[PDB]
Amino acid sequence: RYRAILETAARLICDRGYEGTSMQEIAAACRMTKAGLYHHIQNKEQLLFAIMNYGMDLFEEQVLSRVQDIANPVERLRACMRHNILLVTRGWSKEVIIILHEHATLTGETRAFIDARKKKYVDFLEEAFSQASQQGLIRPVDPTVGAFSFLGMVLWIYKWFKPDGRLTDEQIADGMVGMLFPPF
């Protein structure tokens, strides 16, 4: 219900961009009037804030919640990569893309909160790289270098991947997992 307003405004802000869209174009795209929409939402910046928070809820529901308890740290990184790739290459890519593109559009207060949620994921990856090196499950590497290589590989996917293409997202996930986390 109320999520339908976020998920529809995410489509416009994504294809057309944040600046290109106004609160009026989103009211039209909804069954509400320019007045009705402003009753559910404070302003435009807070609408963007709600979209990004919704995107992190989906990320944590489909990725972090499901892998953060995996005992073996490299098995935890492999699973995290698969879940994160599948999130990027399917329907919820709308809210994920807005988080990356519109990162700089937020105000100071709201960017601090969203980034706090992003930083928990980065710290999750770094900890897993650290544990995996100590236990001899991956070739040693600085945890920060490993985390941002992980994220660079995965999140770059939305720039080139086409679902009608030669390979499925599942085949891509297998390739990246085996290349960054091979048997060791």
Ligand X SMILES: CC(C)CC(=O)SCCNC(=O)CCNC(=O)[C@H](O)C(C)(C)COP(=O)(O)OP(=O)(O)OC[C@H]1O[C@@H](n2cnc3c(N)ncnc32)[C@H](O)[C@@H]1OP(=O)(O)O
Residues contributing to the site for its own copies (CB under 8 A): 19, 139, 141-142, 144-146, 148-149, 151-157, 160, 166-167, 171-172, 175-176, 178-180, 182
- Contacting ligand X (CB under 6 A), which of 18, 54, 59, 124? 59
d(CA 22, CA 140): 49
Does residue 109 belong to the site contacting ligand X (CB under 6 A)? no
- Contacting Cl ion (CB under 5 A), which of 59, 73, 82, 143? 82
| 37 vs 98 by CB, closer to its own copies | 98
Q: What are phi and psi of 92, to 5 degrees?
A: -75, 10
How many residues contact ligand X, by CB under 6 A?
Answer: 20
| 27 vs 177 by CB, closer to ligand X | 177
Residue range at the interface with Ni ion (CB under 5 A); choices 9-17, 79-87, 89-97, 129-137: 79-87
Task: Choose from its own copies, Ni ion, ligand X, none: what does 79 bind? Cβ within 5-8 Å by kind.
Answer: Ni ion
d(CA 76, CA 92): 22
- Contacting Cl ion (CB under 5 A), which of 103, 119, 120, 139? 103
Residues that bind ligand X (CB under 6 A): 59, 96, 99-100, 115, 118-119, 121-123, 144, 151, 155, 159-162, 165-167
